[PDB]
Amino acid sequence: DPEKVLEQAVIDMQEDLVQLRQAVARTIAEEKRTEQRLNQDTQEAKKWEDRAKLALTNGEENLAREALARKKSLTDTAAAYQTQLAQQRTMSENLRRNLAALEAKISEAKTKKNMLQARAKAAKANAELQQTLGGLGTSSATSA
């Protein structure tokens, strides 16, 4: 019957919203992790720059060039992680809007189906009442 079918659909939606919430939480965690990684890498680059300055103090131009290489690697990694974070943010916003839309769909479908079923039941009850009013059988005493 349609009652059971739509009822099961509502129940499945109850699980789907939780699944999407879990996905959103995972995306939040991923973006936080990449933010931390890029943020610490930027500081490692500054530390290597300080080592380069120490080299500039006297002599070790080789140490300065090594520190420059470390800086280049770190900044490239930071740019890559920034791009990854942008992708994660875009995905998070997409999933957030999808969750909002899905919640709206679920709520509207559930409430509309429930009210429709209730009104149909009321209408059929009223029709049955009218039939019974027209279906009175007390006239059978005409036989007696």
Partner: peptide, 16 residues
């Protein structure tokens, strides 16, 4: 600590 930060992100995505 990273797991804690991931949990914080998962809360933030719902913190709206």
């Amino acid at each position: 600590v990273l797991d804690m930060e991931a949990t914080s992100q998962a809360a933030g995505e719902l913190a709206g």
